[PDB]
């Protein structure tokens, strides 16, 4: 609405963000953001953006209001009308994106993991659960 | 008694009452009741009724040509781990009335025609007492 999960103590290398939901029938795109605070315009360590309308999955970061260079995942492991399960796994050198029990993309840290304070999910998605271990 | 299947080869009409009684067991995540349009796997689902104890929601949806529609949600979750329940799913001309514990809980407008329903399928984390169709 967007969904928000606050992480005031940050997340350590060895953290799993598990997201399950349904991509609805007319979905254009949705996003999962790991933000550095609760304020508007907060920096993004990771912006994860499956785009159903253009058949791409874009990864990016945002720092001081300005976006970095987009990375793209190999293919689109999402489909309108289908449920999904995504793991975003924080490691020492980046985030591992796991979709449907298959390694999908590695996004190397651009901001220090130590700054992440919030997980935000928005867009054309119908959330089943958002869990942080 | 899960997975539980009740064949309705002559279909259902306005005034059909699906009465389901059971227990949500102590470590339950979720269960479902499906009104399916045939016995074959992947049959269209006129109604998918999905109480989720783990996320404290009840989701309603449909399935057509293998792809799900847009989820509808009821208010809260009128189920609890460790508690017995009594659900009526009542077919009218306009939709399915979901009744839980002596009270109207949600109205699901028909997405598929009532006349296509051919099968009830209760499954997931529930310990079924009885499934009756009137």
UniProtKB/Swiss-Prot annotation, chain A:
Question: What's the name of the protein?
Answer: Galectin-7
Task: Provide the function of this protein.
Answer: Could be involved in cell-cell and/or cell-matrix interactions necessary for normal growth control. Pro-apoptotic protein that functions intracellularly upstream of JNK activation and cytochrome c release.
The reply on keyword Cytoplasm is: yes
Q: Where is the Galectin domain?
A: 3-133
Give the species. Homo sapiens (Human)
Q: An example Gene Ontology cellular component term from the record? A: extracellular space
InterPro entries, A to Z: ConA-like_dom_sf, Galectin-like, Galectin_CRD
What triggers production of this protein?
Answer: By p53/TP53.
| Binding locations of a beta-D-galactoside | 67-73
Q: Provide the tissue specificity.
A: Mainly expressed in stratified squamous epithelium.
Q: Which SMART domains match?
A: Gal-bind_lectin (SM00908), GLECT (SM00276)
Under the subunit heading, UniProt states: Monomer.
Q: Where is the protein situated, by its record's location annotation? A: Cytoplasm; Nucleus; Secreted
- One of this protein's GO BP terms? heterophilic cell-cell adhesion via plasma membrane cell adhesion molecules
Q: Which UniProt keywords apply?
A: Apoptosis, Cytoplasm, Lectin, Nucleus, Secreted
GO MF annotation terms: carbohydrate binding
Q: Which PANTHER family match?
A: GALECTIN, GALECTIN-7
Q: Does the keyword Glycoprotein apply?
A: no
Curated annotation (Swiss-Prot), chain B:
Q: In which tissues is it expressed?
A: Mainly expressed in stratified squamous epithelium.
- Recall the GO molecular function terms of this protein's record: carbohydrate binding
What is a single cellular component term in the Gene Ontology annotation? cytoplasm
Q: Name one Pfam family in it.
A: Gal-bind_lectin
Boundaries of each Galectin domain copy?
4-134
What upregulates it? By p53/TP53.
What name does the UniProt record give this protein? Answer: Galectin-7
Which organism encodes this protein? Homo sapiens (Human)
């Amino acid at each position: 609405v967007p969904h928000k999960s606050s992480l005031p103590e940050g997340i350590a290398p060895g953290t799993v963000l598990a997201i399950r939901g349904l991509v609805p029938p007319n979905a254009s795109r949705f996003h999962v953001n790991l933000l550095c605070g609760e304020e508007q315009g907060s920096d993004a360590a990771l912006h994860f953006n499956p785009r159903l309308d253009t058949s791409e999955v874009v990864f990016n970061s945002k720092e001081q209001g300005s976006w970095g260079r987009e990375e793209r995942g190999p293919g689109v492991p999402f489909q309108r009308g289908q449920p999904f399960e995504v793991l975003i796994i924080a490691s020492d050198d980046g985030f591992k994106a796991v979709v449907g029990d298959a390694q999908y993309h590695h996004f190397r840290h651009r901001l220090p993991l130590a700054r992440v304070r919030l997980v935000e999910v928005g867009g054309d998605v119908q959330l089943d659960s958002v869990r942080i271990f």
